[PDB]
Design a protein around this ligand. Structure first.
Ligand SMILES: CCCCCCCCCCCCCCCCCC(=O)OC[C@H](CO[C@@H]1O[C@H](CO[C@H]2O[C@H](CO)[C@H](O)[C@H](O)[C@H]2O)[C@H](O)[C@H](O)[C@H]1O)OC(=O)CCCCCCCCCCCCCCCCC
Ligand SMILES: CCCCCCCCCCCCCCCCCC(=O)OC[C@H](CO[C@@H]1O[C@H](CO[C@H]2O[C@H](CO)[C@H](O)[C@H](O)[C@H]2O)[C@H](O)[C@H](O)[C@H]1O)OC(=O)CCCCCCCCCCCCCCCCC
Ligand code: CLA
Ligand code: CLA
Ligand code: CLA
Ligand code: CLA
Ligand code: CLA
Ligand SMILES: CC1=C(/C=C/C(C)=C/C=C/C(C)=C/C=C/C=C(C)/C=C/C=C(C)/C=C/C2=C(C)CCCC2(C)C)C(C)(C)CCC1
Ligand SMILES: CC1=C(/C=C/C(C)=C/C=C/C(C)=C/C=C/C=C(C)/C=C/C=C(C)/C=C/C2=C(C)CCCC2(C)C)C(C)(C)CCC1
Ligand SMILES: CC1=C(/C=C/C(C)=C/C=C/C(C)=C/C=C/C=C(C)/C=C/C=C(C)/C=C/C2=C(C)CCCC2(C)C)C(C)(C)CCC1
Ligand SMILES: CCCCCCCCCCCCO[C@@H]1O[C@H](CO)[C@@H](O[C@H]2O[C@H](CO)[C@@H](O)[C@H](O)[C@H]2O)[C@H](O)[C@H]1O
Ligand SMILES: CCCCCCCS[C@@H]1O[C@H](CO)[C@@H](O)[C@H](O)[C@H]1O
Ligand SMILES: [Cl-]
Ligand SMILES: [Cl-]
Ligand SMILES: [Cl-]
Ligand SMILES: [Fe+2]
Lengths: 38, 81, 451, 334, 342, 137
């Protein structure tokens, strides 16, 4: 159970970091019209 | 457009309100008196608050005979007084 | 009539307030007039409550939501939450009502008489939504204001007579807080607690020292943040993450208010410290616990050995164990064993409810309180018939906790919807397609087929 | 481009057969976990002590259920609102007895479905659409939140969350009626107007557009071949449809503006379902349906029943029989 | 050739604010009398002699509790005509016996026929296909199944739904407790058609509104549509890509889409009606025999199916004496099914 | 049926004397019972001890007898267990315990008589519903 907990913690942190860094990665500019929204 | 006078013309006209400032309150008052005079109870056969049960009765006057139902209701009504 | 039809503004009457987006003077008026409406209601509603208030009935039998907020600050009440003086309630109501006139005056003036834009009137008061530095400045001012408000609570609790403390030794009473909790391990510890059962995140705050200490931190954090935001401009990574427009900013605040609303719903539903049960009635968990307590007392008076009494299921009829072994009340209230309240805690030992305390130490005040709370559980109909859904008409009661939790759920929910509506629109407007797809430049038509 | 850049370009790509996106990065794993657990549990899970009274209820197919009776059973009343991940159990056997799969499934699902809503915004943005499909999806989503999270919170237990099953759903409905008189609550009434009206307007829109399709085919082919995907010209005559409907009722009761019509089609069911969801979410804190029990009294004080009192008798039946071994004290307070 | 029939036909079909037609001769009186009867009864008329209930504003009921209630069980399926053998021409007695119930149900039935005839008549005049009339067959099948067929299979009109908000709720709960109607796959198909229809309504409206072409300068986008325009107001191609990518499939054919919008809720309603026809005969989906065999033999075997039947048994025992007064049920406290404490 | 003077005539004492309450007294009694008592005693039951109800026959068998105005008025001043053996003012609303049950603070002697009359009159109207609980709803 301890190993499972840690594994899930690491899995969740991995995906959450992808979500946050991903939306921080110039998301307003990822559209088909006007990109210079900064 | 289907030929009739626009509603918005009608209800913003003075003549409409001359008429309806009478007829509307007349109808409302007549409905009021239909109840306040007790006429409504008589027309529809609805019990008044004192007429659901005889004084000591606690049995519903349920209709149990299809063809004598009118007479049963009448007997129930007699039992009140 | 500047920008006051659809043809000139681009917005229909039903979105008419969007005509204000770039008219800073008229928009100031709308905001100040609105603040007036809020303050008016606080004032008027208090006076209505006071007019309708019978001092010797519990507040919670009287449909009161505002008097309980004033009482919780220590005004007008004494031991047990008894009302000792209604004048503080009158003062709060009157001063709010008077103040609303002033806000209404300013609001109406800026809305229909003052300069419709502020920018050519004043560089200080005018603003462009897209000016990042000016937006953080105004944000900064408002943070300072909010921090001063949090420190007002601190000042009330420490220097101006205290707060109502349901936990006060020997019975609830107004108490001055002399040792607010400053330790950041405790204060920020609440913030990292699980929101699940037995933990309850910030809603678990259960003593006034932590509450006051919390506001000391918040007030200082907010004042510092305000100075920071006045003295800086947003960094590159923030510039790249956000949409910078009035509608975008609205969206972010709607999101925030939604979140706060759901939190407030949970606070009034579970918390009996900053929402004392003396004023708000028992919590749902509290009343269910109180029922078990009531019948334990009754049946034990009759000779029942309540520790050894096996219920129909094999679990203890009155007392059983929680999943970690603590002695708790039985029946369906097993779910509520995390409940804590001053009338019950004297019966609690290190391993939970203590059988010797139960057998020997239950005082008549505890019996009274449990009976009171069991019979004022937060259940009732929309037309304010108290009790279970099958109960007959007789008791006119809906708990203030039910009114407050339901209203704030509804409002938080629609605010989430507004967050989504305005955030999605802000995005589309910023990118230039909020009015629809350009027929001659339809993006999908330039993309490869999916298959 | 570096790896992170390339990865971001792929995640947000408008060319993936199924859009991934940042929402999708959370949605995909959480939905897969919820789905896989649900399927396995629905098939093979042992009985679960839903009511915390050591009275296990069998939900799975292998333990004597069919598709209609089967369910993944809510977590135990002993747990209440406590968080019961696999790793808080001493063993999977305990986890199973106590209804651990329920929590794993509903939490992964609610997270995943919230990200499904976000993903609808996200793709609309990538494709240059207007953004509010996600707002329409907030209606069913809010409803799932109400029955799986908000109601449990209010009542103090995930044991009172809607079961993941067909009969389980009906159990939740009947007990909800007993406890809240939901039928008499105006928010559930708005919900009914929302779905009956959504169905009515669905049929009405379908029938009126179908009525007015322009002749482009012969009698030995489907009229559907008269429309080609992506053609510029509208395929029905809205003027004829309005001509029809405006005479069916009267002129100003019919929409001649397609945008206004399609907005109404969105708004009617969405708003009604938002009120349905809010009904459940506010009955969660026991503000219940209208109670007119014994509201009509005669001159003496005899109770004169109305149809509300008959409802009340049905409700009482439900109340006294539900969870027949779980109550020890006279009032059902949660 | 130019005779009175043709002249009347002319008049009936004039293009006026409210279209009349030949169908109007049936529709207007029947609809007016059904609506007027409902308003009359809910406002003034009791259910004391038929049900032992107050049912009107006059007696103190509100919009939720008023009803025009069914006749006494002893009337059987009597047409209950004003001039019939029960009321014998006495309007007051007729009201007291529940004559307004058959009045409303029968004028309502003929009114619905008139409405569907109107849909046909108008379609024919304007030159459209009669799918709206076809779709309205669902409401007809529901009305006929629930208000006419159901009570006709039962003992009397007593057991039809009474026309009232709370009265209809009572009808739902009766069907749960006595028929286990939630368990019926025909009701389930109903549910799926109604909820599915609501889904399609929401999703189609939102999709059109979110794939609009920019056809004006306004931020409020309704004015950028002209009824007479040739072109689609929204992009089917963008809508199609969106849904293909979000959900995996998407509509590509607008005629199919709008046909499906007819089919789903219409088919659902029609299925629910078939189930109610079975309930007329108590031909229920009440039980799973395999479940009952197991549970009878094994006192540890419990499912949500068994739990619901216990609820049903409560409903029946607790509601029957007041809900079925003609049976004169007396159920001593000691026989009433109850769980612990409650 | 009407709320007659006969319905409103109830025993004053254990010795055969009666008192005929006015319609205003009946209404006051209902209001006051709702105000001070119905949170536990709605419909003539007792939510915190369902074994004891407010039925007239139950009150007759209480010690001292509580099936008359004097017995009920005395109960509201100095409540006892059903056998008369213990004084329960510390856990039951009474004038004697108005300090801890503050709703009792404003009740006058007139008010106690009205509440008492309500307890005696209501079963005359409602029959077994009075003290019957949910079974008779
Ligand atoms: C950006 C946001 C990003 C989100 C990422 C996700 C991060 C994790 C959060 C997940 C959601 C939380 C679920 C559990 C909420 C819950 O059980 O919350 C309840 C808790 C309170 O918990 C209770 O807190 C109690 C505290 O009281 C204790 O202390 C008191 C002190 O007076 C008393 O003494 C009391 O008797 C005593 O028990 C106890 O611990 C209870 O056991 C415990 O259950 O509230 C709380 O923590 C705060 C409540 C949170 C908000 C409510 C959720 C609403 C979301 C719905 C959205 C709808 C969406 C629509 C989409 C369309
Ligand atoms: C499609 C959509 C089209 C648009 C809709 C159009 C709507 C138009 C309105 C039509 C109204 C029809 C009313 C029918 C009334 C009826 O039936 O009234 C019922 C009477 C029979 O009366 C009943 O008879 C019963 C049995 O009696 C018999 O048995 C008893 C017990 O032994 C005694 O011996 C008794 O004397 C003996 O007569 C009981 O007495 C009942 O109380 C009594 O009401 O039959 C009769 O009038 C006639 C019976 C034969 C013809 C029925 C055709 C129509 C009904 C079809 C649905 C059938 C239901 C099946 C359910 C599945
Ligand atoms: C809290 C609610 C609120 C507030 C504060 C505002 C504020 C405003 N709206 Mg909005 N609006 C609202 C709700 C609100 N709105 C709602 C619900 C709708 C939909 C019906 C609208 C629809 C709408 C449209 C279509 C338009 C506005 C516009 C405006 C602005 C100009 C109004 C004007 O020219 O008045 C002219 C009216 C008068 C001169 C009549 C009197 C109005 C005053 C303020 C009444 C005050 C009474 C009060 C009791 C006085 C107390 C005084 C005392 C303290 C001394 C103003 C800033 C306009 C705008 O954007 O301009 C650029 C605009 O075109 N609004
Ligand atoms: C957070 C908001 C809120 C909350 C929780 C309450 C809570 C309460 N109010 Mg208050 N009040 C409010 C806002 C609120 N009020 C506002 C804005 C006004 C000005 C209209 C009032 C004016 C007011 C009066 C005059 C009185 C109350 C009273 C009460 C009590 C009975 C409520 C009742 O029977 O409603 C019945 C329920 C409804 C009317 C349903 C409202 C449903 C809405 C339309 C849904 C809308 C959805 C979404 C917002 C859009 C209760 C404690 C009564 C009381 O006991 O005073 C001591 C009373 O007499 N309140
Ligand atoms: C957020 C609220 C707010 C903001 C940003 C403004 C902004 C402005 N107002 Mg308005 N106004 C307001 C509220 C506001 N007003 C209210 C409530 C009223 C009713 C009394 C008015 C009545 C008003 C009039 C009649 C006029 C203005 C004018 C102005 C302009 C010049 C202000 C100035 O020079 O003061 C400079 C600074 C001072 C005079 C010192 C400040 C003194 C205040 C009282 C200190 C209070 C501080 C305290 C923290 C406030 C707590 C509030 C809280 C309890 C709610 C400026 C655009 C003028 C204008 O537009 O010219 C055409 C103008 O003639 N305002
Ligand atoms: C209403 C109050 C408020 C608002 C709207 C803002 C807004 C802003 N601040 Mg400020 N700030 C504030 C108060 C506020 N601040 C206070 C009180 C302080 C003092 C502590 C600061 C100190 C501060 C600093 C030091 C900086 C900012 C910066 C910023 C900018 C970027 C913020 C951002 O990316 O957030 C979003 C947050 C993140 C992207 C961080 C990671 C997200 C995690 C995972 C969120 C997890 C929480 C989750 C939802 C659960 C809630 C419960 C939780 C408490 C456990 C933006 C202009 C930045 C800037 O540009 O300054 C010029 C910056 O460097 N602010
Ligand atoms: C299209 C219009 C229309 C339709 C279809 C109906 C249909 C009905 N009405 Mg309604 N009604 C209407 C308009 C209509 N009504 C109007 C305008 C009024 C206000 C005056 C009423 C007032 C009314 C009342 C008060 C009642 C009815 C009732 C009825 C039902 C029984 C009718 C019956 O047995 O007729 C039998 C007659 C015919 C079918 C006519 C046939 C004509 C033939 C073809 C010609 C032969 C005539 C012959 C020469 C006569 C000689 C007899 C002589 C030997 C003595 C039926 C549902 C009853 C009901 O609902 O009970 C529950 C009832 O009590 N209706
Ligand atoms: C803009 C606009 C708007 C809005 C507005 C607003 C929102 C306003 C507000 C306003 C306000 C917000 C106002 C207020 C006022 C107040 C006042 C006027 C007060 C007074 C007071 C007094 C007089 C007092 C008295 C008393 C006392 C002192 C004590 C006790 C008793 C008594 C109470 C008597 C609208 C929507 C219309 C639209 C158009 C535009
Ligand atoms: C007073 C008090 C207290 C304390 C308090 C405190 C200390 C608080 C704090 C608070 C805090 C400290 C808070 C925080 C918050 C945060 C948040 C809420 C966040 C948000 C975020 C966001 C929203 C983001 C977004 C995004 C991302 C994710 C990335 C990408 C993009 C974007 C940017 C969009 C206590 C409890 C002790 C007691 C009672 C009283
Ligand atoms: C049966 C009968 C008959 C007939 C009758 C009739 C035809 C009647 C009619 C009646 C009517 C025709 C009535 C009416 C009434 C009405 C009412 C009673 C109304 C009410 C309303 C309301 C209450 C409303 C409300 C509202 C509004 C306004 C808006 C929105 C919101 C609400 C909904 C709140 C005859 C003689 C042949 C024969 C024998 C039997
Ligand atoms: C309470 C927590 C306290 C946290 C304090 C620190 C604040 C958080 C800072 C996050 C910094 C991330 O900064 C962000 O990183 C990503 C990842 O390379 C950058 O990189 C991105 O640049 C462009 C921007 O148009 C994208 O097209 C590209 O795909 C990507 O590489 C962003 O342009 C940068 O702004
Ligand atoms: C912003 C307006 C606030 C008005 C402040 C009123 C003081 S409040 C006052 O403070 C006293 C000590 O000085 C306490 O003894 C007393 O209990 C308290 O009510
Ligand atoms: Cl159950
Ligand atoms: Cl219990
Ligand atoms: Cl008894
Ligand atoms: Fe369409």
């Amino acid at each position: 159970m301890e190993t499972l907990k840690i594994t899930v913690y690491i899995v969740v942190t991995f995906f959450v970091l992808l979500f946050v860094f991903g939306f921080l990665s110039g998301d307003p500019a990822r559209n088909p019209k006007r990109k210079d929204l900064e | 457009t289907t030929g009739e006078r626009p509603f918005s013309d009608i209800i913003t006209s003075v003549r409409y309100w001359v008429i309806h400032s009478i007829t509307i309150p007349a109808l409302f008052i007549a409905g009021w008196l239909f109840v306040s005079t007790g006429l409504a109870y008589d027309v529809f056969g609805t019990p008044r608050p004192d007429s659901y049960y005889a004084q000591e009765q606690r049995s519903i006057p349920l209709v149990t005979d299809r063809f004598e139902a009118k007479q049963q209701v009448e007997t129930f009504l007699e039992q009140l007084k | 009539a500047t920008n006051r039809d659809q043809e000139s503004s681009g917005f229909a009457w039903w979105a008419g307030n969007a005509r204000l987006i770039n008219l800073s003077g008229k928009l100031l008026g709308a905001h100040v007039a609105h603040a007036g409406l809020i303050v008016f209601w606080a004032g008027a509603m208090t006076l209505f409550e006071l007019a309708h208030f019978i001092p010797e009935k519990p507040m919670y039998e009287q449909g009161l939501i505002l008097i309980p907020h004033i009482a919780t600050l220590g005004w007008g009440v004494g031991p047990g939450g008894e009302v000792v003086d209604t004048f503080p309630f009158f003062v709060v109501g009157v001063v709010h009502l008077i103040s609303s006139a002033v806000l209404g005056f300013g609001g109406v003036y800026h809305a229909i008489r003052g300069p419709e834009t502020l920018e050519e009137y004043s560089s200080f008061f005018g603003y462009d939504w897209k000016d990042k530095n000016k937006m953080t400045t105004i944000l900064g001012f408002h943070l300072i204001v909010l921090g001063i408000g949090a420190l007002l609570l601190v000042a009330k609790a420490m220097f101006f007579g205290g707060l109502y403390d349901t936990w006060a030794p020997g019975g609830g009473d107004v108490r001055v807080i002399t040792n607010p909790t400053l330790d950041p391990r405790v204060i920020f510890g609440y913030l990292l607690k699980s929101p699940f059962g037995g933990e309850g995140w910030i809603v678990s705050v259960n003593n006034l020292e932590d509450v006051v200490g919390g506001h000391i931190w918040i007030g200082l954090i907010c004042i510092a943040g305000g100075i920071w935001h006045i003295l800086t401009t947003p960094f590159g990574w923030a510039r790249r993450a956000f949409i910078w427009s009035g509608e975008a900013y609205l969206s972010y605040s709607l999101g925030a208010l939604s979140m706060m609303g759901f939190i407030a719903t949970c606070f009034v539903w579970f918390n009996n410290t900053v929402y004392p049960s003396e004023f708000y009635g028992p919590t749902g968990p509290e009343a269910s616990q109180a029922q078990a307590m009531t019948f334990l007392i009754r049946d034990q008076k009759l000779g029942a050995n309540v520790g050894s009494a096996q219920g129909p299921t094999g679990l203890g009829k009155y007392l059983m164990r929680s999943p970690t072994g603590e002695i708790i009340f039985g029946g369906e209230t097993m779910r509520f064993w995390d409940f804590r309240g001053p009338w019950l805690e004297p019966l609690r030992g290190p391993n939970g409810l203590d059988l010797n305390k139960i057998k020997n130490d239950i005082q008549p005040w505890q019996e009274r309180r449990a009976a009171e709370y069991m019979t004022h559980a937060p259940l009732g109909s929309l037309n304010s018939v108290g009790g279970v859904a099958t109960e007959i008409n007789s008791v006119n009661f809906v708990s203030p906790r039910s009114w407050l939790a339901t209203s704030h759920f509804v409002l938080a929910f629609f605010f989430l919807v507004g967050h989504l509506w305005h955030a999605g629109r802000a995005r589309a407007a910023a990118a230039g397609f909020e009015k629809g797809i350009d027929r001659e430049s339809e993006p999908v038509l330039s993309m490869p087929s999916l298959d | 481009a570096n790896l992170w850049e390339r990865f971001c370009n792929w995640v947000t790509s408008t060319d993936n057969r199924l859009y991934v996106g940042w929402f999708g990065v959370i949605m995909i794993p959480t939905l897969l976990a919820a789905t896989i657990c649900f399927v396995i549990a629905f098939i093979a899970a042992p009985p679960v002590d839903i009511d915390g009274i050591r009275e296990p209820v069998s939900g799975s197919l292998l333990y004597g259920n069919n598709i209609i009776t089967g369910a993944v059973v809510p977590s135990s009343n002993a747990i209440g609102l406590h968080f019961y991940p696999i790793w808080e159990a001493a063993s999977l056997d305990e986890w199973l007895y106590n209804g651990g799969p329920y929590q794993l499934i509903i939490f992964h699902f609610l997270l995943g479905a919230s990200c499904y809503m976000g993903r609808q915004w996200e793709l609309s943005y990538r494709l240059g659409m207007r953004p509010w499909i996600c707002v329409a999806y907030s209606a069913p989503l809010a409803s799932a939140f109400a029955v799986f999270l908000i109601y449990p919170i209010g009542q103090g237990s995930f044991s009172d969350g809607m079961p993941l099953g067909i009969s389980g759903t009906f159990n939740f409905m009947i007990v909800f009626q007993a406890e809240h008189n939901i039928l008499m609550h105006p928010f559930h009434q708005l919900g009914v107007a929302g779905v009956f009206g959504g169905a009515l307007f669905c049929a009405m829109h379908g029938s009126l557009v179908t009525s007015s399709l322009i002749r482009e085919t012969t009698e030995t082919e489907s009229a559907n071949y008269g429309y080609k995907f992506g053609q510029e010209e509208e395929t029905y005559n809205i003027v004829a449809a309005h001509g029809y409907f405006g005479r069916l009722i009267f002129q100003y009761a019919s929409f001649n503006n397609s945008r206004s019509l399609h907005f109404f089609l969105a708004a009617w069911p969405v708003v009604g379902v938002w009120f349905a969801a809010l009904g459940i979410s506010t009955m969660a804190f026991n503000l219940n349906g209208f109670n007119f029990n014994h509201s009509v009294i005669d001159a003496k004080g005899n109770v004169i029943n109305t149809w509300a009192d008959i409802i009340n008798r049905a409700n009482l039946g439900m109340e006294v029989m539900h969870e027949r071994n779980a109550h020890n004290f006279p009032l059902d307070l949660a | 050739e130019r005779g009175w029939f043709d002249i009347l036909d002319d008049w009936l079909k004039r293009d006026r604010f409210v279209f009349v037609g030949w169908s109007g001769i049936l529709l207007f009186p029947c609809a007016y009398l059904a609506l007027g009867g409902w308003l009359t009864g809910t406002t003034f008329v009791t259910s004391w002699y038929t049900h032992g209930l107050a049912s009107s504003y006059l007696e103190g009921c509100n919009f939720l509790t008023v009803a025009v209630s069914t006749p006494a069980n002893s009337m059987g399926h009597s047409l209950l005509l004003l001039w019939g053998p029960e009321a014998q021409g006495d309007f007051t007695r007729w009201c007291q016996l529940g004559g307004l119930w058959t009045f409303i149900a029968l004028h309502g039935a003929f009114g619905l026929i008139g409405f569907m005839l109107r849909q046909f008549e108008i379609a024919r005049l304007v030159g459209v296909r009669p799918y709206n009339a076809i779709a309205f067959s669902a409401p007809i099948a529901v009305f006929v199944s629930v208000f006419l067929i159901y009570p006709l299979g039962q003992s009397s009109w007593f057991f039809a739904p009474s026309f009232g908000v709370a009265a209809i709720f009572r009808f739902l709960l009766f069907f749960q407790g006595f028929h286990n109607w939630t368990l019926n796959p025909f009701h389930m198909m109903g549910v799926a058609g109604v909820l599915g229809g609501a889904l399609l309504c929401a999703i189609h409206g939102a999709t059109v509104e979110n794939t609009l072409f920019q056809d004006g300068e306004g931020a409020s986008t309704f004015r950028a549509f002209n009824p007479t325009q040739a072109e689609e107001t929204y992009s089917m191609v963008t809508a199609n890509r969106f849904w293909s990518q979000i959900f995996g499939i998407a509509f590509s054919n607008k005629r199919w889409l709008h046909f499906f919008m007819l089919f789903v809720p219409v088919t659902g309603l029609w299925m629910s009606a078939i189930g109610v026809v079975g309930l007329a005969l108590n031909l229920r989906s009440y039980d799973f025999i395999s479940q009952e065999i197991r549970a009878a033999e094994d006192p540890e075997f419990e499912t949500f199916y068994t739990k619901n039947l216990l609820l049903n048994e409560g409903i029946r025992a607790w509601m029957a004496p007041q809900d079925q007064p003609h049976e004169n049920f007396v159920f001593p406290e000691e026989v009433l099914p109850r769980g612990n404490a409650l | 049926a009407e709320l007659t003077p006969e319905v409103l005539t109830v025993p004053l004492n254990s010795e055969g004397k009666t008192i005929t309450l006015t319609e205003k007294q009946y209404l006051e009694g209902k209001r006051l019972f709702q105000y001070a008592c119905a949170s536990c005693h709605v419909g003539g039951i007792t939510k915190t001890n369902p074994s004891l109800d407010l039925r007239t026959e139950t009150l007759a068998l209480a010690t001292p007898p509580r099936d008359n105005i004097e017995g009920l008025v005395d109960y509201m001043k100095n409540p006892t267990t059903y056998d008369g053996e213990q004084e329960i003012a510390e856990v039951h609303p009474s004038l004697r315990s108005a300090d801890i049950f503050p709703k009792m603070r404003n009740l006058t002697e007139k008010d106690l008589v009205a509440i008492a009359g309500h307890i005696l009159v209501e079963p005359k109207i409602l029959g077994d519903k009075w003290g019957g609980g949910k079974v008779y709803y």
